[PDB]
């Protein structure tokens, strides 16, 4: 046999690949790019005021933030129509933007008594157990009163320094600039960004009715306890009103067919595991199917969890003078994309099983497979030295370089050096004794010696495989 059985097993895979490709082409269009590009350039690439050149992307002080919040921010939220506020005369600013603050309390840490004459207070780094909850300043509104995480429908964020909660002191802004500017001025006069503040969030969203794509915008600013400002941004093109055009029904039908295909595969895998050979995991061709089906079922579960959860849109459509809460939907969309992008990768990778249709491809596959059993040991022995260099660099230079400021950053820096991108022109300033020594040793031992065993093993394996397959003709 081996032919009349594989032909069905091949066409069933080809149809699966076609459906997956249709889905991938469907979700990713070419209109999201320019949408997000203009949306980002409107807020990030514009100076706070015409008399300086410090944009939100390069904030450096607590004072610059106030210049930003009344400035390039208000100028890019409210556009006078030739009341509603269309950003680019196409994008609709639905709802109102909301600002929020996360801060810690006075006396959150301890100082020694021998120098407790000059140090009058300390503000410890942000922690859920050290977060202030008392009302400060003038106790008028929601901007000076703590609010629990469940009363804001919020969640965690996982910023750059730490993972911030969903609570804090929040404030909703108006619809016209005339009142939003007054509110911001009121916040700035009665000092609101004190020394105790640790994080600030700004959130809003737009519609852009021409195409059907919501865009949710979040801006984070972090204040480390050691001083400084760290900005971050996130623009997400969500889509929530899918069924309008025929292509949408086409995509839904392809999704249904995809679910049917994955159900078929899981059934034929359970049948094979139970009604046939047990513990068939020494193949790498069946350990790939389980990964694909698990990733697919996780993606389907996430889609069912998220798509069926859209009542927040209905609540916003009831009254459209309140802040819409679309933060969870963007997070789940990001998670769904991160899963689909890996699923399609493995689906494409699986195609290698189907290419043995002549001598050359078969022998290349044999060489590639036989060369994996022994490359594994050298890969481990090489990665051990790689991590040794990584930890050495992290311990030595990981305090002044900022390219080695984190372990994974050290790994990426080493890989970039391997590609030939990073030069040590700053390492001497970082260190003059152990800098050039480390650089020379790394670029000599792991680029002239260690990196050639990979070539040697492959070269020898291919040579012996070809010689064996040629000798396989002296017997026949």
């Amino acid at each position: 046999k081996y032919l009349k059985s594989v032909l069905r097993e091949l066409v069933t895979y080809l149809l699966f690949l076609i459906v997956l490709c249709i889905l991938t082409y469907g979700m990713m269009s070419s209109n999201v790019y320019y949408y997000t590009r203009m949306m980002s350039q409107l807020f990030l690439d514009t100076p706070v005021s015409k008399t300086e050149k410090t944009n939100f992307k390069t904030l450096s002080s607590m004072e610059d933030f106030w210049k930003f919040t009344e400035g390039s921010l208000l100028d890019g939220l409210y556009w006078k129509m030739q009341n509603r506020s269309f950003i680019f005369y196409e994008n609709l600013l639905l709802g109102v933007p909301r600002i929020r603050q996360l801060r810690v309390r006075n006396g959150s840490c301890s100082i020694p008594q021998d120098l407790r004459d000059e140090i009058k207070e300390c503000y410890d780094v942000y922690s859920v157990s050290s977060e202030d909850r008392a009302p400060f300043g003038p106790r008028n509104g929601t901007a000076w009163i703590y609010t629990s995480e469940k009363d804001l429908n919020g969640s965690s964020h996982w910023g750059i320094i730490a993972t911030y909660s969903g609570a804090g002191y929040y404030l909703d802004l108006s619809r016209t600039r005339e009142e939003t500017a007054a509110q911001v001025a009121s916040l700035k006069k009665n000092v609101w960004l004190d020394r105790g503040t640790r994080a600030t969030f700004i959130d809003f969203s737009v519609y852009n009715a021409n195409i059907n794509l919501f865009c949710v915008v979040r801006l984070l600013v972090e204040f480390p306890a050691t001083g400084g400002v760290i900005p971050s941004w996130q623009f997400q093109p969500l889509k929530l009103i899918r069924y309008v055009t025929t292509f949408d029904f086409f995509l839904a039908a392809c999704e249904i067919i995809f679910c049917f295909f994955i159900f078929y595969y899981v059934v034929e895998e359970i049948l094979e595991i139970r009604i046939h050979k047990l513990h068939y995991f020494r193949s790498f061709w069946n350990c790939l199917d389980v990964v694909i089906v698990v990733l697919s079922v996780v993606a389907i579960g996430i889609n069912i969890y998220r798509t069926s959860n859209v009542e927040v849109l209905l609540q916003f459509l009831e009254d459209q003078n309140t802040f819409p809460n679309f933060e969870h939907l963007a997070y789940w969309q990001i998670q769904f994309n991160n899963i689909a992008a890996v699923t399609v990768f493995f689906v494409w990778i699986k195609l290698f099983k189907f290419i043995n249709f002549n001598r050359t491809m078969s022998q290349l596959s044999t060489t590639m497979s036989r060369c994996a059993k022994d490359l594994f040991g050298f890969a481990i022995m090489f990665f051990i030295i790689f991590l040794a260099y990584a930890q050495l660099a992290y311990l030595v230079f990981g305090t002044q370089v900022d390219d080695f400021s984190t372990f994974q950053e050290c790994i990426f820096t080493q890989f970039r050096i391997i590609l030939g991108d990073i030069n040590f022109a700053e390492i001497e300033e970082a260190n003059r004794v152990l800098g050039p020594i480390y650089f020379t040793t790394f670029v000599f031992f792991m680029f002239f010696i260690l990196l050639n065993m990979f070539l040697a093993i492959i070269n020898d394996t291919y040579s012996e495989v070809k010689s064996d397959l040629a000798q396989q003709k002296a017997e026949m």
């Binding site: 922690s127 859920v128 157990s129």
Partner: peptide, 29 residues
């Protein structure tokens, strides 16, 4: 006479390293 602290998120690397060493030595042994 008991407490479920869960106060912070700053992990203590000493216990993690000790446990990792104690399991790695067991595996190799």
């Amino acid at each position: 006479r008991f407490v479920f602290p869960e106060p912070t998120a700053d992990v203590n690397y000493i216990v993690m390293l000790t446990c990792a060493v104690c399991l790695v030595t067991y595996m190799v042994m």
